[PDB]
Amino acid sequence: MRKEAIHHRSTDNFAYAYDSETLHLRLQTKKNDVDHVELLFGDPYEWHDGAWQFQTMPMRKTGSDGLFDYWLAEVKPPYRRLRYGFVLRAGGEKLVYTEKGFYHEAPSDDTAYYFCFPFLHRVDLFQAPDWVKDTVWYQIFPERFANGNPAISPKGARPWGSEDPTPTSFFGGDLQGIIDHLDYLADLGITGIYLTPIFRAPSNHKYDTADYFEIDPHFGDKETLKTLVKRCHEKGIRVMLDAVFNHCGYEFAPFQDVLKNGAASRYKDWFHIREFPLQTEPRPNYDTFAFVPHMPKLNTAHPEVKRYLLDVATYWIREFDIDGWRLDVANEIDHQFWREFRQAVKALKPDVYILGEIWHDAMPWLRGDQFDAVMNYPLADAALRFFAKEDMSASEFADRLMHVLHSYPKQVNEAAFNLLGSHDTPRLLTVCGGDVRKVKLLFLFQLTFTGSPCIYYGDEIGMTGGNDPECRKCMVWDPEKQNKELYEHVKQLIALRKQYRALRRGDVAFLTADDEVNHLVYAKTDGNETVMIIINRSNEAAEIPMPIDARGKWLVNLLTGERFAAEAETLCVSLPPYGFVLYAVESW
C-alpha cells in the first residue's frame, strides 16, 4: 500500500473549517492503492480507563488527479476540538496513518499520536462574500468599450481596418460609455462589472497611476462614476475597481518629488531606490514592475505609504459604494499589508470583494486573512489547453482539473474568479483558431463550472484580437459585425446557470475514459440537483454514453426543452462535430 503516496497535514486544504461547526479533512493516497479509508477521531479530552476514546467514520473518494486520489471527511467535532488519524484498508492490509507515523492498529494510550485540529474558530474561518458565488462577471477596459460625452484624448477615432487596430493609443472610450450600454449587459445577464484602472494616468491603461484619488478626466468625474454605480446597483450589478498598489507611474507626485529633492525628498523611502542619482539607464536602478522605469515599486512596508494606499482602498468604498477591489500584481506585495488591507475594507463594507491577480498557486493568500480569491488563471490554462489548443485529453483535462481544484479548501473554490482571458491574454476566439464552435464549448465549460466567472467584454460577440495589445480592440457595437449566434449562446447559459444552482455552486464529477480521448462528461450536483454535461471535443459526430440514475424521473434537455424519461442504466448521447448538451435529471 505504497506509503510514499499517502499524506496529510493539519493545515490549509488538507484540513480546514467549512463553517463554524464543520471541519473538512482530506487524505491523499496513491491512484487505486486504497479501497477504503476511515477517519479515526475524538475529542483530545475524551478518555476512559486511561485510554483516549474515539470512534471512526467512513471517508469517500472525491476525485483524483493523475496519480493521487484524495478522500474527504466531513466532521462536526463536539466542543469544537478534535484529534484525528486515518485508517486506510486495501484488502487484507490495514494501516493507521497518524501524524506520528503508521500503525497496524490505532494507538489509544496517547493523543499525541494523531494529527490535531485544536479549536474551530469562526474568526479563522475562511469566509468570502456569499454574493460573489452567484454572480457572473464582465470585465470592461474603459478606454475601448463605449464612447460617451467626448471629453476624450485628441487621437484616433473609433475602429480601423478589420485587423491592425489597438496601437497602444486611446480611442476615446470613457465611463459615460458603460452608463449607456448598461442595458446591453443587463440583457446579457452579467451581475457585476470588473473594470480596469480608471484613476488619473497618462496612458490607455491606467497602471502608470498618477493619482489614486482622482479619476482620469478622460473617463469622467465622481459624478459620472456615482451614476455608473447607482445605475448598476439598480440593475443588480456590482462594480469592482482595480487597485494598483504594487507600483505607480513616472507621474505620481511622491516619485515626481524624488526628482526635485532626491535624498532630501521626504519620499525617498516611499520606494525601493537601491542606488541614488536615480538612473534608469540600462534599466531602472530601483525596483520596478518588470523593468519598467515608468513604474517604480512602492514600499508597502513604510507606515506612510501603507497609510496612503489604505486610505485609497477605503475612499472609493465610502464615496462610491463600490463592491470590490482587484489587486494588480497582488502577489508581489508583502503579506503584512494585505491583512491590514482586508481589515480596513472588510471593516468599512464587509461585502467588498477582494480579488488578487495571481497566475499561480495562491494558497499563501487564500487562508482567510487576506484575499477572498484570485484571478484563477490555472483553470483557464487547463480549459484553453483542452478546448483551444486541444493539447491534452479529456482524462488529462479532468485530472488537471480535479487537481488545482483539490489544492484549496472548498469555500476558496466556491468563490474563485474563474476567467478565461483578459486584457492581458490573446482573445478567446483567435485562440480557438476562429472556430466559434470551440469558443461556444469554452463558455459552456466556464458558465457550467462552480465559482464566480468573468467574461472579457469583447469575447461574447465573436470578437477577435489575440496577444496584447491586440486583445483590447474597440468593442464591436455593430449588430452586423457581432456574432449574435454566439452572443445568444452565452445569454442562455448565464440564465441556465442563474436558475440551476448546481451549476454555480455545486460539486463537479468527471466521467472520462482513457481510450476515448475526446469525450468529456461531468455532473454538477448540489443536494437533489443534478445537471449533467456531455461534450464531444471532436470534429466528427460521436456517441458519448451518459449514465442515468434509477431514482431519476425525468431528463429534461436544457436549451431545447426535450424532456424524456430515464428508464435506462445508460443513454448513448449522439452529438455533432463539436456538439454538446445539458441535462437536468429529476427525481422519482
Add this chain to the structure above:
Amino acid sequence: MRKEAIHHRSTDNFAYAYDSETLHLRLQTKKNDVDHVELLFGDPYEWHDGAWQFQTMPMRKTGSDGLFDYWLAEVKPPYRRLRYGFVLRAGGEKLVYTEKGFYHEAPSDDTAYYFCFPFLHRVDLFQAPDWVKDTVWYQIFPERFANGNPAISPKGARPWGSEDPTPTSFFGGDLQGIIDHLDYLADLGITGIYLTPIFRAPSNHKYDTADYFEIDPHFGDKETLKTLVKRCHEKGIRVMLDAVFNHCGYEFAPFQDVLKNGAASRYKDWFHIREFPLQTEPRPNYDTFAFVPHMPKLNTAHPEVKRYLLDVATYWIREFDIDGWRLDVANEIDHQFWREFRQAVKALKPDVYILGEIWHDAMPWLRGDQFDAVMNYPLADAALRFFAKEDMSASEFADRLMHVLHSYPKQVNEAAFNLLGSHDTPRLLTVCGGDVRKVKLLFLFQLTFTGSPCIYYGDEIGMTGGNDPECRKCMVWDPEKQNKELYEHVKQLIALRKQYRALRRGDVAFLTADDEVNHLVYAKTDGNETVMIIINRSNEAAEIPMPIDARGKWLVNLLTGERFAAEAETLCVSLPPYGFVLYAVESW
C-alpha cells in the same frame, strides 16, 4: 522514477525566505529514486527572443525520513522575484517537475509553467530573536523550587517520604526562593528561566488565574519580581513568564460577575456560555479547558477581552522587562488574536520571546506572523522513544528526527524550544527506569541538538517523580540527596555547547545503519566547525565506527581532552555499555 513521491509547494517549509536576500526551496522525492535534482530558475521578467530565460543550479540531499529524501536549494534571486521548477535525473530518466506538471524538457515559452516566489520581503521573513538561539532554558515551578520569606500558605512543610509527596498541595515555594539559588543556576550554566504562572490564583498551579495583573501574594510582589529580573539580567538570564489567556479561574472577576448578574452581566460574551443558568452539572455547559468548570474558556474574539489580555501581555513587559511569554494552550486560541499579540509585544520590546504550547505540528503558527516557536514536544517524543523506552531504533530515530526537522523552515528550527519534559510529563529519570546512564545520554542529545533547549529544574540532579503531579516534587537541595555526578555531566555539556557553535546553531547529519540497531553517530556542523557525537545505546561494550575527514588535522576528544590526529578514513570508537563521546575535528 515514481512521481507519487515527488512534491513541492511554494509555501511553508518547502519554500520560504531565510534572510532578506536568500530563498530556501526544498524538493521531496522517493527514498533513493533520484540520483540528482537541479533547480531550474530565473526572474519571471527575464526573457529573450520570446523565450523565458533561466539557468540551473544543483541541489543537494539534506536528509530523508523513512520514505522521502528532501533536497535543498539556496538561491538569492536578483531583484527579489523568481520563478522555478526542478530537474530530477535518475540515470537516463530526466523529468522536469513544475507547478503545472512534468516535462521531459524545460518549457520556455511561458513562465506560468513553473512554481513561483513573487517577491522576497523582509517583513514576511520569519525572524525569531537571535538570542534565544544561544541560551539554555531552565523551567522552574515556583511552588516547589525554593522557599523564601515565608509569606506562604498554611500547609505541608518541605518534602515527605522518599516517595509519595506532591499531593496537589502547596509546599511554601516562592519568588524569593529563585532570587536566592540564582547562583546555583548561574553555576550550572543556564541563560534563562521559564517559570510557570505566578499570577494571583488559588492553586499550587496558577492556571486557574484569578488576576493577570497581580502576582499571587504567596510568591511575592512587584518588588520581589523586580529583583528576580534585575538580578537575572545581571547574571545573563532572561526571564520568561507564563501567559494563560485561553481560560481563567472560577475566581476571575468577570466570570465571578457572571454569577451575580448572569445575562445582565456586562461580561456575558467574555466567555463561551452556550446555555445560561450556568450549569456545570454532568460537566460545564460552557466551554472549558478540558471539562474543567473551574476553567472557563475566554472569548478572544471579543474586543474587550482581546484588549484585556493584550494589555496584560504588555504590562509585565513594561513594568518588569521580562524577555518572553509562554502561551498555555496557545493552539486553542484563534489565530487572529495571536497576530495582534505579536504586534503589541514585538512593538514594545522586539526581543521578547513568544513561545506557544503545542504538542503537535505547529506550522500554522510558525509562519512568522504569530509565534517565535513552540514547546517542541514531538522531538522529545522521539528522544524518549529512543533512549528511554528504547522503542525504536537508531535508524528509525534518525528518520523520525530528520522528519519533524524538515517539516519546518530552518530559522523555525533554529529557535525551537527543545525540552524533554516539564510539569506536565513523567520525570526524565523515572522514565529511564532509574538508569541515570540513559538520562546522561538524553542530556547529551538535547544539549547537542540545535535550537533553544530547556531543562526541567529537578531533572538535572537525578530527581525522580513520574507522571503528574509526581513530576512537581519539591526541589532536592540536599548535596547528598542530589546526584552530583549527573549535575556535573549537564554542566560540562552546557559549556561544551556555549563554546562550540555547531552544537547550538548548526546542521545535524545522522550516520545510522539498518543492521546496527543501537549505534547512533551524527555530526553537528557549522562552517568549518564539526563536532561528532558517537553513542552506544546498548548495555554492552560496542565498537561504533566514525569516519574522519582527510582535511582534519586534530581530533580533540571533549570532556577528556585526549587530542589525537586523524590520519585515517575511519576510527572504530570503542564505548562501554551506555557510553558515548564527543569529538571536535580540526582542519589542516
